Amino acid sequence: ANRTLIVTTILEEPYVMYRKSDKPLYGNDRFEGYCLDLLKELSNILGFIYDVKLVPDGKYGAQNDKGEWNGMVKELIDHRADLAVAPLTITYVREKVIDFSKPFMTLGISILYRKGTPIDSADDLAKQTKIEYGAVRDGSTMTFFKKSKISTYEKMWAFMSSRQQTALVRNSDEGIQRVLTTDYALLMESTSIEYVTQRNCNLTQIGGLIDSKGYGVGTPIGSPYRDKITIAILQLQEEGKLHMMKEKWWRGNGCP
Numbered sequence: 001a002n003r004t005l006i007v008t009t010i011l012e013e014p015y016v017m018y019r020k021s022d023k024p025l026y027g028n029d030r031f032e033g034y035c036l037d038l039l040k041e042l043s044n045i046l047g048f049i050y051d052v053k054l055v056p057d058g059k060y061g062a063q064n065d066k067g068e069w070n071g072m073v074k075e076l077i078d079h080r081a082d083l084a085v086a087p088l089t090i091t092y093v094r095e096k097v098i099d100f101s102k103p104f105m106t107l108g109i110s111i112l113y114r115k116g117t118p119i120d121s122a123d124d125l126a127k128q129t130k131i132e133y134g135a136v137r138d139g140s141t142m143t144f145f146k147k148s149k150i151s152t153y154e155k156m157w158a159f160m161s162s163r164q165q166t167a168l169v170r171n172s173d174e175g176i177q178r179v180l181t182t183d184y185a186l187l188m189e190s191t192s193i194e195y196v197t198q199r200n201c202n203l204t205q206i207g208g209l210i211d212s213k214g215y216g217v218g219t220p221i222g223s224p225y226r227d228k229i230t231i232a233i234l235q236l237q238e239e240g241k242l243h244m245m246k247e248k249w250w251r252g253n254g255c256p
């Protein structure tokens with residue numbers, strides 16, 4: 001039989017979450033979400049079983065000043081996993097070091113905050129001095145700011161980086177808690193903003209999308225699975241299955 005593929009992933013609602021059960025769950029059964037459904041579909045099409053393993057460092061992946069990676073990206077570079085199936089953003093810097101499938105979803109960075117302020121854009125947010133802001137450490141949103149040559153975003157990066165211990169959060173849950181309990185706005189991806197703002201009516205998006213990009217399945221460079229996964233994604237796309245999966249995991253409207 002074909003070797004069981006190792007899948008690196010990360011907890012991120014509603015892509016990957018612990019299943020709620022009153023009885024013990026083991027192995028893959030512990031998890032559910034859009035990305036687990038995606039894996040069930042991909043594995044049927046490609047003919048494999050898999051072992052889902054949460055990334056040990058809890059990070060998506062960024063490189064330090066020495067060019068050393070962490071998170072799921074490092075797991076792929078180091079051939080610790082066969083696939084990364086997660087809301088993993090397809091970026092220029094990552095594409096040079098891993099192979100991504102074609103995208104299964106598109107999104108852009110925007111701002112999550114509480115309601116009640118006149119802040120209407122990133123320009124507004126960068127200019128004012130009352131509300132702090134940041135991003136999840138070692139993800140693509142942090143990297144977007146670090147690499148930007150747009151003045152507003154360069155200033156925002158300098159601010160986040162100056163207050164890195166403060167401004168850059170460990171994960172999306174910490175970021176959202178910070179938004180809810182302190183004067184802090186979180187830079188994050190639009191599909192996640194859509195999800196949370198339909199569940200907690202104290203939260204809102206500020207402004208529009210600042211960029212546009214996709215999520216893809218990651219594989220190590222040269223992986224014989226990447227093209228097969230791309231073909232499977234296109235199948236699911238064209239059959240309307242990806243659309244159905246989005247509806248299943250995002251439904252339904254909870255806030256005015």
Ligand SMILES: N[C@@H](C[C@]1(C(=O)O)C[C@H]2OC[C@@H](O)C[C@H]2O1)C(=O)O
Pocket residue numbers: 012060061087088089090136138139140141142171172187188189190192
């Ligand atoms: N998709 C990103 C990770 C992350 C980000 O950098 O925005 C962290 C986490 O942040 C909350 C929401 O944006 C979903 C997740 O995206 C990545 O692939 O690095």
